[PDB]
Amino acid sequence: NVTGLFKDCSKVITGLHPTQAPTHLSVDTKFKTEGLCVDIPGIPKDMTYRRLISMMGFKMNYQVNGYPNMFITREEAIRHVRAWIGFDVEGCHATREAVGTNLPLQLGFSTGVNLVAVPTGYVDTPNNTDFSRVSAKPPPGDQFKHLIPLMYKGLPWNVVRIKIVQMLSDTLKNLSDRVVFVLWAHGFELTSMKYFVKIGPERTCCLCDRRATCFSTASDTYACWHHSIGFDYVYNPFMIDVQQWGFTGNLQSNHDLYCQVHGNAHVASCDAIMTRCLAVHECFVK
């Protein structure tokens, strides 16, 4: 039994040296014997590798005292409808030095904003994990053609995450003490949140009594939506996957049952607007 979380997407045929492999599975077969591993004199460590590690497959089903749930029930989401922000991400695929994982390319929100990121991944090396630009291409197909020019219009993730925090703060500071990302088929949205979300126990802002919604790696401080200028991470967001409410077909077919004003313009922000709109019609209309 294995998971795809942290799958090694490199094209290297062999596994790793026992001192460098993060796990027993990742150790090369040559070192495995008698249920464990052995050091083999004369077989050296690899001092130049770059192995892309997949961030697909997170499971946020922990229950730890003092840490809030990220995924919330439909009833809780309804009470916080003012905090709803639809969110969708269009990805690009790892290619060349790696294959088998999706990287965020166009991040779209129900505010109508689309942010484009440089294709970036988590590359294990002999010394650390290097969060860095990786070779990528849009998926093939006429439905993904619009992503082609975006491959060269991306911003570095350190800039994209500041822009996400600023956009959420401007939109929500007078509406809610939190954010609820409204999702449809959440897997890749949760993988994308690894790039701009941090979690921990519930905290208060550095300048007031409000709960903290943002975190700054510059000072290791917390802020609410009013005091987050310059902050780079979204802290303790909430989320709900609308697809889990009993729908059968795709997003657009279900959205179109209640709504006609949101035509599909085929872009992350449009999918984010359709997702929030469908959730609003399902929970509050008629």
């Binding site: 090694d8 596994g15 993060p22 796990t23 027993h24 591993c37 730890v64 088998g100 650390n128 941090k198």
Partner: protein, 131 residues
């Protein structure tokens, strides 16, 4: 395409720690709320006649220890997150780490909680000959 590195028993804990502001505190809290320690580490077969030093080039477990591959006992390596070292580099990856047998059920938690003496090379409280 690709090759799996992990098992489903570690999905929850690694996901929780991969998103945390403070991964070490998240791991400690996950254990205190009844979670299982991270498994699938690189445990070595050795002769248990080693020096007993904490961090070594080859396995050096004495009779009170087990030897593991260094990266596999490092929470930051396991979660593929930043290391809290000044230049962000790891001190365990590329070495073997000796863990007291009484603590070998949770090597990651052991390395998070403990410190190596720079004078004698052994773990403080688990072999250090200085104090």
């Amino acid at each position: 395409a690709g090759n799996a590195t992990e098992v489903p028993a570690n999905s929850t804990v690694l996901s929780f720690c991969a998103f945390a502001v403070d991964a070490a505190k998240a791991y400690k809290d996950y254990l205190a709320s009844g979670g299982q320690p991270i498994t699938n580490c690189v445990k070595m077969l050795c002769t248990h006649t080693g020096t007993g030093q904490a961090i070594t080039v080859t396995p050096e477990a004495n009779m009170d220890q087990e030897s593991f591959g260094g990266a596999s006992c490092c929470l930051y390596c396991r979660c593929h997150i930043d290391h809290p070292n000044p230049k962000g580099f790891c001190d365990l990856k590329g070495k073997y780490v000796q863990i007291p047998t009484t603590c070998a059920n949770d090597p990651v938690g052991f390395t998070l909680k403990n410190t190596v003496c720079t004078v004698c090379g052994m773990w403080k409280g688990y072999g250090c000959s200085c104090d």
